[PDB]
């Protein structure tokens, strides 16, 4: 699966000239994996977004180019663009999606997650339906039913709530 | 659910230049969650409300951006603006809406709440109708019937009255 | 229900500058409820009534702002403006309106109240009409029919007469 | 029917730079119909009114572009520009024009409308001529004879008067 | 530990306009530690509190900036603001907290301290409880149990009483 | 080890436009080491922060470029920027880290350092733990255990406290 060129272009088109200049400047000093070259200063300091996109795709592979662009954007502080690019490249698959079974089987403090997600994402009837479940696995199974209608931001909020509540569980899942 | 940019813009546009400058100054030293950067002084000390809103949504996501804006505003002392922002981001969902079932089940001192809400919120006929109910759960069920016509301020007043009357119930519900 | 800005402006606009200075000075040491900030001295000691009203509504909500203004006015000794603001915020609803049924059902010495209210509030015709009633509940029901034409001061006088006559009933009703 | 470019240009050219920037900012979060894209931030935050008109007509069709511009303008609170744009796009056709026969046939309280329109729109001679009519349909037919000389604002005032007088008729006609 | 920006802003914001000018004037002649520059007259004589705080933090670090501000405020005579800034910078840690063990072990005349603190700080029942202790170390240990509920002013009063009673013990303590 | 370009950019992005012109002007007269040229006035007086950073890295190497930038910044009086740049360039290595063994072996007046660091950096428990140590080397070994959690400012505070306490040891160690 490829077609990440359009994702990179979309990420690069939602930032102004003063941010594009900073991105190009920071591209000159970012650490690189072995076997990959560096773009010369002569051409890099004059390209626009359109030329930068296919230059990035040519010099670094599509996957590595996408992840390098995400890392550079995250370093500059632009979290929205990095999140959008990560969502585009990784499809509609999030961290909670890969570890779904472990999250339904090992989480304990459901009420903290419900309180964190109440109002911002969950509606009143959904909150009551989730709270009506007897046991924690049942609550988790009911809660995950609303995930397909969510976007990247809501999933990130849920992950942040889980990290704040149970750091040990998420650290174990990372390993 | 998004649309937090409009809420942030409304919150930031309703405060004067002297408060905006203090807000920008306090944005430089507010504690930040891990993984988030800080706005440089060069650009921050010259932005207006629109640019500040755009940069706030850019560096921090809509959820965390709104939360940070509310925290900074309530640190400045502007409680009205923070309350309006919380109402906008959370929709018409309040603390009393979340724990409605427990509140119509565990509260005892209803006449104190009625005295606190008399005149300012409740009318004479509504007060008489609530007083006509035989038991406390019936009184609470009748009282919650008028909630949809209320705004954030009335719900905050009711929460304050509940906290003053039965602090233990409130601290148990929040925890 | 809001509209407290107009009430606060009317209360603060009906006092002279020398006692406006005293109001501003006493606003610096009044005890505050939990979770509310304090106005800095640099700006507070230089504003007029128009700016003071806006900042009072800004830092403290309309409800708590009106309550704090009434408390500060009562502490200064100005009962007239404090009572006017109390009437404005609580609408045309008084203590006697809240406990009308209990007052009609439990009061005994109506003659003392009639003597206290004679001339100052009631004319000869109303006095004779009330005296013509056979029993105490009938006298109270006849008397309460004249309340809609009264103002805050007459109701306060009636409450004072009730407190002087039957203090135990008043302290029971308030608690 | 087209020519929406001139209407959009006239609407956008009659507003200052500071609210132009607000319009551009709010164009980034307005809900969109399915099948329509969003203008990237890179170009949107730099173009002026002349470029913005062409961009709006390109990305969105003339009809939907005008509708979206009017919706955003009403969201900002500027009702004069939105009304002018509606008048330009819909030609000299108003709500009262489309439902003329039903309005002449079903309205009852003509005198309230005449009182609302007196002085602001109708002259003394026209008012007397309308009052001289025997029955309500005759009064309405006489009143509608002066409509061609009116503008959008007068028709909006008449519609507001009708809505305030007979709300049920208006809500029936609109549905 | 940082966050001295908030403390400096609070200290500068609670002082009036005619004495902010005196503060700025005295900032031009205060002795400076080696390696630190002096703010030029051109910009200093036009700033308000918001720019002054940022300039102070930029030119002198947070620690030295807070110390210099406290020294200048003390020279001006404003002891309350200097004490507030000192409390904010050093956290809730006072001189008595630093030498707690030495104070409990070496002080003799507890009665003078109790007489100085009676009424103003200590209540009757806890004064009696302290007086009930058999020996001086027990009296001091019981007295220090009420310290956490005190503020900076009470601790300053206790230190002043200690200086008046046993000057030699203090001057040994700081040196 | 390089990566000084990012540190230089971060230092240059945290100063306003008024200070950027002063920095560029100071760059035209700063003494230079042998073999290094001077930036011409034609291009220097028109660059922004990004172009200035690139040109500084181009003409002067990363090491000498960072050193010259720090020297110019501390000449201007902005000690915070110079300190942050020194911390970024030299990594988390300070003067105290370089002479750790000599400082633990040759210092005498630990109490002055503890008094200087009390409250601002050290907490009460840490202060008591350090005071509990019998001898000076043990006290210093305990004190250095808390160093990894500190930042550049705390280390500078400790360094200036040492310099004030006994300057002879500092001037011996630096030479």
Report CA torsion sign: A150, A154, A160, A164. Answer: negative
Cα–Cα distance between A156 and B35 in angstroms, integer? 13
| Angle of CA points B10, B14, B20, to nearest 5° | 105
The widest CA-to-CA distance across chain E, in whole angstroms, is 65
Distance CA B84, CA E52 (A): 31
Quote the minimal CA–CA distance from F167 to chain B in Å.
34
Contacts of B73 (CB under 8 A, 6+ apart): B11, B23, B81, B82, B85
**How far is it, in rounded angstroms, from Cα D127 to Cα A110?**
70
Q: C88: closest CA among C156, C162, C5? A: C5
Beta bridge partners of E122: E118
CB B156 within 8 A of CB C61: yes
List, as one string, the DSSP characters of F31-71: ---TT-----HHHHTT--HHHHHHHHHHHS-HHHHHHHHHH
DSSP A55-71: HHHHHS-HHHHHHHHHH
B74 in reach of chain E (CB within 8 A): no
In 3D space, the residue among A73, A96, A94 whose CA is nearest the CA of residue A7 turns out to be: A73
Asked if F42 and F99 count as a contact pair (C-beta separation under 8 A), the reply is no
Kindly calculate the radius of gyration of chain D based on its CA atoms and give it in whole angstroms.
20
B24 to A33, C81, D94, D143: CA distances (angstroms): 39, 39, 47, 58
Instruction: Say which residue the tokens 């003071």 belong to.
Output: C52
Tell me if chain B has a CB within 8 Å of the CB of D74. Answer: no
* D14 Rama sector, left if φ>0, alpha if ψ -120 to 50, beta otherwise: alpha
Instruction: Of E81, E115, E126, E106, give the one whose Cα is nearest residue E168.
Output: E106
- One-character DSSP codes across C49-101: HHHHHHHHHHHS-HHHHHHHHHHHHHHHT-HHHHHHHHHHHTTT--HHHHTHH
Check A120 against B1: CB less than 8 A apart: yes
Joined together, the tokens standing for residue B118 give 């008399």
How many whole angstroms separate alpha carbon D108 and alpha carbon D85?
A: 32
Chain A CB contacts of D39 below 8 Å = none
Structure tokens that stand for C95 in this block: 């203590």
* E-F contacts (CB, under 8 Å): 45
Identify whether the C-beta of residue C153 lies closer than 8 Å to the C-beta of residue C83: yes
Which of B2, B3, B54 comes nearest D25 by C-beta? B54
To the nearest 10 degrees (0 to 180), the angle between helices B62-76 and B17-26 is 110
B 79-98: CB under 8 A from C: 79-81, 83
B131 close contact with F: CB closer than 8 A = no
Residue A168's CB is within 10 A of a number of other CB atoms, namely 7
**CA dist., res. D2 & res. C12, Å (int):** 58
Distance CA A11, CA B50 (A): 22
Q: Is D38 on the interface with B (CB under 8 A)?
A: no
Query: How far is it, in rounded angstroms, from Cα A33 to Cα F21?
Result: 39
Cα-Cα-Cα-Cα dihedral sign, residues B165, B169, B172, B173: negative
User: Does F17 lie at the interface with B, CB-CB under 8 angstroms?
Assistant: yes
Q: Closest approach of chain B CAs to the CA of E62, in angstroms?
A: 12
Cβ A54 vs Cβ A9: under 8 Å: no
Interface probe, candidates A18, A79, A155, chain B, greatest B C-beta count within 10 A:
A79
Burial of B164 (C-beta count, 10 Å sphere; 0-12/13-18/19+):
middle
Instruction: Enumerate residues 6+ apart whose C-beta is below 8 A from D54.
Output: none
The answer to whether D29 faces chain B, any CB pair under 8 Å, is yes
The residues, any chain, with a CB within 8 Å of residue B24's CB and separated by 6 or more, are: B44, B45, B47, B52
Contact of B41 with chain A, judged by CB distance below 8 Å, is answered with no
Angle at CA of residue C143, ends C142 and C144, nearest 5°: 95
Which DSSP letter does residue A147 get?
A: G
Comparing CA positions, the residue from E77, E163, E162, E41 lying closest to residue E111 is E162
Judged by a CB distance cut-off of 8 A, whether residue F14 touches chain B is yes
Contact (Cβ atoms closer than 8 angstroms) between residue B99 and residue B169: no
Do F and D make contact via 3 or more CB pairs under 8 A? The reply is no
Residues B59/B37, Cβ–Cβ less than 8 Å: yes
Question: Burial, A157: exposed, middle or buried (Cβ in 10 Å; 0-12, 13-18, 19+)?
Answer: buried
Per CB-CB distance under 8 Å, the chain B contacts of C89 are 119-120
- Centre a 10 Å sphere on the Cβ of residue E8 and count the other Cβ atoms it contains: 24
C-alpha separations of A37 from A30, A31, A60, B114 in Å = 12, 11, 8, 74
Neighbouring C-alpha atoms within 13 Å toward the C-beta of C57:
16
Work out the minimum CA distance from F4 to partner chain A, whole angstroms.
9
Burial E35-45 (b: 16+ CB within 10 A, else e): eeeebeeeebe
F6 within 8 A of A26, measured Cβ to Cβ:
yes
- β-partners of residue B118 are B122
Question: How far is the C-alpha of F67 from the C-alpha of F11, rounded, in Å?
Answer: 12
Query: If we measure between CA atoms, which residue out of C107, C137, C139, C108 comes closest to residue C122?
Result: C139
Burial pattern D37-56, b for ≥16 Cβ within 10 A else e, equals: eebbbbebbeeebeebbebb
Structure tokens at F22: 């002063």
Check residue A160 and report its DSSP letter: H
Q: Is B157 on the interface with D (CB under 8 A)?
A: no
| Closest by Cβ to C57, choosing from B80, B115, B121 | B80
Contact state of E6 with B29 under an 8 Å Cβ cutoff: yes
Give dist(CA F175, CA F169) in Å, integer: 10
Residues contacting residue C164 through CB under 8 Å, at least 6 positions apart: C112, C116
CA distance C84 to chain B (A): 15
Distance set, CA D89 to CA C61, D2, D53, D93, D155 (Å): 45, 8, 15, 9, 16
Measure in Å the smallest separation between the Cα of B32 and chain F Cα atoms.
17
Structure tokens at E141: 């240990």
Q: Do E6 and B22 touch (CB under 8 A)?
A: no
In angstroms, what separates the C-alpha of F149 from chain A's closest C-alpha? 21
Task: Report the interhelical angle of E49-59 vs B17-26 (nearest 10°).
Answer: 20
How far does the CA of residue F101 sit from the closest CA of chain B (Å)?
Answer: 34
Query: Tokens in use for E142?
Result: 């019981």
Are E63 and F119 a contacting pair at CB < 8 A? no
**Dist CA A29 CA F50 (whole Å):** 14
Helix, strand, coil content of chain C in percent (nearest 5): 70, 0, 30
Structure tokens at D83: 């009304």
In the block, tokens 């200035």 appear at F52
Beta bridge partners of B122: B118
The string of DSSP letters for chain F reads ---HHHHHHHHHHTS-HHHHHHHHHHTTTS---TT-----HHHHTT--HHHHHHHHHHHS-HHHHHHHHHHHHHHHT-HHHHHHHHHHHTTT--HHHHTHHHHHHH---HHHHHHHHBTTTB-HHHHHHHHT-SSHHHHHHHHHTTGGG--HHHHHHHHHHHHHH-HHHHHHHH-
- Say if residues C158 and C117 touch (Cβ distance below 8 Å): yes
Report the neighbours of D using a cutoff of 3 or more CB pairs below 8 angstroms.
A, B
Which chains, if any, share at least 3 CB pairs under 8 A with chain B? A, C, D, E, F
Q: How far is it, in rounded angstroms, from Cα E119 to Cα A31? A: 68
Q: Is-contact B79 C60, C-beta < 8 A?
A: yes
Please list every residue in chain E whose beta carbon sits closer than 8 Å to the beta carbon of residue F76. Answer: 37
Q: With beta carbons less than 8 A apart as the criterion, state whether D144 and D104 touch.
A: yes
Say whether residue D45 is in contact with chain A using an 8 A CB cutoff.
yes
Which segments of C80-166 are extended strands (E)?
none
Q: Which residues does chain E have within 8 Å of residue C41's beta carbon, measured at their own beta carbons?
A: 14-16
Which of E11, E87, E88 has its CA nearest to residue E49?
Answer: E11
The alpha-carbon gap from F75 to the nearest alpha carbon of chain E, in Å, equals: 8
Alpha helix locations (H) across chain B? 4-13, 17-26, 41-44, 49-59, 62-76, 79-89, 95-98, 100-106, 110-117, 124-132, 136-143, 152-165, 167-174
Q: Do B153 and C63 touch (CB under 8 A)?
A: yes
User: What is the Cα gyration radius of chain E?
Assistant: 20
- Nearest CA of chain C to the CA of E105: how many Å? 38
Contact of E37 with chain F, judged by CB distance below 8 Å, is answered with yes
Residue C29 near chain E (CB below 8 Å): no
- Cβ proximity of B83 and B152 under 8 Å: yes
Angle, helix A110-117 to helix A136-143, in steps of 10 degrees = 30
Q: Are residues E149 and E126 in contact, defined by beta-carbon separation less than 8 angstroms?
A: no
Q: Which two structure tokens, joined as six digits, stand for B54?
A: 């755009």
Residues F152 and F81: their CA atoms lie apart, in Å, by: 12
C122 DSSP β-pair partners: C118
Which of E47, E40, E158 minimizes the C-alpha distance to E107?
A: E158
Instruction: Tell me whether residues B60 and A78 touch, CB distance under 8 A.
Output: no
Q: Give which of E41, E60, E93 to mutate to test F binding, by max F Cβ within 10 Å.
A: E93
**Residue D49 to residues D9, D29, D45, D62, E89, Cα–Cα distance (Å):** 7, 19, 11, 16, 52
**E125-160 as b/e, with b when 16 or more CB fall inside 10 Å?**
eebeebeeeeebeebbebbeebeeebebebbbbbee
Please tell me if residue A124 touches chain B, with a CB cutoff of 8 Å: yes
Contacts of D29 in chain B (CB under 8 A): 2-3, 5-6
CA distance E120 to F139: 40
Interface test with A, best of B61, B86, B103 (most A CBs within 10 A): B61
* Residues C169, F88: Cα–Cα separation, whole Å: 75
Structure token digits, residue F55: 């040109």
Do E16 and C41 count as a contact with CB atoms less than 8 A apart? yes
Resolution limit, Å = 2.7
DSSP string, A40-108: -HHHHTT--HHHHHHHHHHHS-HHHHHHHHHHHHHHHT-HHHHHHHHHHHTTT--HHHHTHHHHHHH--
Closest CA of chain B from D23, distance in Å: 10
- Give me the half-sphere count of Cα atoms (radius 13 Å) on the Cβ side of residue E39: 25
Cα distance between residue F175 and residue F164, in whole Å: 18
Closest CA to D143 of D119, D159, D122: D122
CB contact under 8 A, A14 and D46: no
Q: Which two tokens stand for residue F140?
A: 């210093």
Cα–Cα distance measured from residue E52 to residue A42, given in angstroms and rounded to the nearest whole number: 44
Across the interface, whether the CB atoms of F78 and E59 are under 8 A apart is answered yes
Long-range CB contact pairs, B110-115, < 8 A, 24+: B110/B136, B110/B139, B110/B140, B110/B143, B112/B161, B112/B164, B112/B165, B113/B143, B113/B158, B113/B161, B113/B162, B113/B165, B114/B143, B115/C98
H/E stretch holding D141 reads helix D136-144
E76 touches chain C (CB under 8 A): no
Distance of residue E54 Cα from the nearest chain B Cα, in angstroms:
8
Half-sphere exposure of E159 (CA within 13 A, CB side): 17
Return the structure tokens found at D111. Answer: 């005198």
Using DSSP's 3-state secondary structure scheme, residue C19 falls into: helix
Cα distance between residue D72 and residue D64, in whole Å: 12
Distance CA D76, CA D79 (A): 8
Closest Cα in chain E to B72: E6
Quote the Cα angle for C12-C17-C19, to 5°.
75
Using the CB atoms, write b or e for B20-30: b if 16+ within 10 Å: bebbbbbbbbe
- Cα dist from E57 to B136, E13, F77, whole Å: 58, 15, 11
Q: Which of C145, C29, E99 is nearest to F127 (CA)?
A: E99
Instruction: Report in angstroms the alpha-carbon separations of D44 from D18, D47, D48.
Output: 15, 6, 9
Q: Is D100 at the interface with chain B, CB within 8 A?
A: no
F146 token code pair: 């808390």
């Amino acid at each position: 699966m490829g077609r990440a060129r359009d994702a990179i272009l979309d990420a690069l088109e939602n930032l102004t000239a003063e941010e594009l200049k900073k991105f190009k400047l920071k591209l000159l000093s970012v650490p690189l994996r072995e076997g990959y070259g560096r773009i010369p200063r002569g051409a890099l300091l004059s390209m626009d977004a359109l030329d930068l996109t296919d230059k990035l795709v040519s010099f670094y592979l599509e996957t590595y180019g996408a992840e390098l662009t995400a890392n550079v954007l995250r370093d500059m502080g632009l979290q929205e663009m990095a999140g959008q690019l990560q969502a585009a490249t990784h499809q509609g698959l999030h961290f909670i999606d890969q570890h779904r079974a472990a999250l339904i089987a090992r989480v304990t403090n459901v009420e903290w997650l419900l309180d964190a997600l109440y109002g911002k994402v969950l509606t009143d009837e959904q909150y009551q339906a989730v709270r009506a479940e007897p046991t924690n696995p049942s609550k988790m199974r009911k809660l995950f039913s609303f995930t397909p209608a969510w976007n990247w931001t809501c999933k990130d909020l849920l992950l942040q709530a889980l990290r704040e509540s149970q750091s040990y569980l998420v650290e174990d899942l990372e390993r």
